[PDB]
Design a protein around this ligand. Structure first.
Ligand SMILES: CC(C)(COP(=O)(O)OP(=O)(O)OC[C@H]1O[C@@H](n2cnc3c(N)ncnc32)[C@H](O)[C@@H]1OP(=O)(O)O)[C@@H](O)C(=O)NCCC(=O)NCCS
Ligand SMILES: CC(C)(COP(=O)(O)OP(=O)(O)OC[C@H]1O[C@@H](n2cnc3c(N)ncnc32)[C@H](O)[C@@H]1OP(=O)(O)O)[C@@H](O)C(=O)NCCC(=O)NCCS
Ligand SMILES: CC(C)(COP(=O)(O)OP(=O)(O)OC[C@H]1O[C@@H](n2cnc3c(N)ncnc32)[C@H](O)[C@@H]1OP(=O)(O)O)[C@@H](O)C(=O)NCCC(=O)NCCS
Ligand SMILES: [Ca+2]
Ligand SMILES: [Ca+2]
Ligand SMILES: [Ca+2]
Ligand SMILES: [Ca+2]
Ligand SMILES: [Ca+2]
Ligand SMILES: [Ca+2]
Ligand SMILES: [Cl-]
Ligand SMILES: [Cl-]
Lengths: 126, 126, 126
């Protein structure tokens, strides 16, 4: 019925690429869950892949009203896709607990990227 | 009621300008309906005009859940404005058929551009 | 509860910084209410602070459906924050009068910035 939260985020792709060039998997694993890493490792544009997931998760954390804090971690969010490529967001851990407290029934996520920037928006509704 | 789709897109204006300098009307006509072409032709900043429409339409195609695919074309989306300048989105063709299947009753669109980027967000609600 | 409006906006931070270097308070006071100026004055990154507020207010004005026109001014939008850092939008002046006529009961705002750009999205719900 009503919107419980709204979140948006923009990420500079070159910054994510630089971080991967320096710290690689140590950096990717802080952001991605084990299930997401398979898809990540398969990509030939890993910085772009990670930039999008980073924007999506930050946008989700803001829609929750906590950001990546108060027990909410990047691993509480998992990004997947439907059969036509639409991105989907699934919550776990503290994010799932807060969503339940807020009575969230539907989650909407959209992602976009151009050469230099990735962005995402998330809406939680009850 | 509830949100049935969310879409967002960011477009680099310079790439649109380069495409117009090379292919002009042939490129513009792939994105714009005949009705929209009249407004486009009267514009004195065509690359900027077209980048905004491009972002709006891709955002709308993501809100429908298909992208520009599965029979959904750029011509299935028409952008107009109300008397105060608010952008309005009207669907046709396969986009309209899918929206009808999604029970879409209200469509919201917002657009913004700065010197180098144009972006848009679309929300479909039932 | 349906969506009354949606607004989005992107702002180039260096343009805001340049404006401040030239016009300072004359510029800042056009965008910010006296109450918001207190927080602004305490910031050590005033250009970035102001770029975010500028984006939030422009987005809010688009969600209302008027833009910054028709008696609606930048001062009709006040950005505050909750204890966890979530941004909150409160309307006044003509914006509040119009929102009341539209039966707006819930307002949602999200803001994000990266090195060069600030962006925001606003949704008004009845
Ligand atoms: C908000 C967060 C997710 C992102 O921070 P950031 O990249 O500086 O944020 P962005 O510029 O995209 O967003 C800043 C805006 O987010 C919004 N925000 C902050 N806290 C929020 C909250 N609890 N809920 C919703 N929105 C929030 C605010 O509008 C803020 O700007 P403002 O304070 O001027 O209004 C933050 O919780 C965070 O970065 N936490 C730690 C993340 C981390 O571990 N980082 C290491 C890198 S892997
Ligand atoms: C999705 C589409 C609309 C835009 O493609 P794009 O510009 O590469 O996409 P963007 O970079 O803006 O966004 C990519 C994201 O869109 C989202 N997306 C993809 N398919 C989607 C769908 N069916 N529904 C909703 N969102 C979708 C995804 O999150 C994707 O990123 P991810 O796969 O890493 O999660 C695509 O269907 C398209 O444009 N197809 C035809 C190609 C075309 O005509 N191009 C223009 C030529 S002039
Ligand atoms: C909408 C406004 C807030 C910003 O316009 P802008 O600088 O062109 O900003 P953007 O590029 O971000 O937005 C343009 C889009 O906003 C949208 N828009 C315009 N009027 C709108 C309205 N009444 N309601 C909702 N959206 C609107 C349109 O989609 C427009 O693009 P289009 O005409 O190509 O479709 C406008 O009312 C304005 O500039 N007011 C004056 C603000 C001011 O005082 N500026 C001085 C600089 S401090
Ligand atoms: Ca961020
Ligand atoms: Ca892209
Ligand atoms: Ca795109
Ligand atoms: Ca502009
Ligand atoms: Ca603007
Ligand atoms: Ca930032
Ligand atoms: Cl234009
Ligand atoms: Cl700041």
């Amino acid at each position: 019925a009503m919107i419980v939260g709204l979140g948006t985020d923009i990420a500079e792709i070159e910054r994510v690429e630089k971080a991967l060039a320096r710290s690689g998997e140590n950096f990717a694993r802080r952001i991605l869950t084990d299930s997401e890493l398979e898809q990540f490792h398969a990509s030939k544009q890993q910085g772009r892949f990670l930039a999008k997931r980073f924007a999506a998760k930050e946008a989700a954390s803001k829609a929750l009203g906590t950001g990546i804090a108060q027990g909410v971690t990047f691993h509480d969010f998992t990004i997947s896709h439907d059969k036509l490529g639409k991105p989907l967001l699934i919550l776990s851990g503290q994010a799932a607990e807060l969503a339940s407290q807020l009575q969230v029934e539907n989650i909407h996520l959209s992602i976009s990227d151009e050469r230099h920037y990735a962005m995402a928006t998330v809406i939680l509704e009850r």
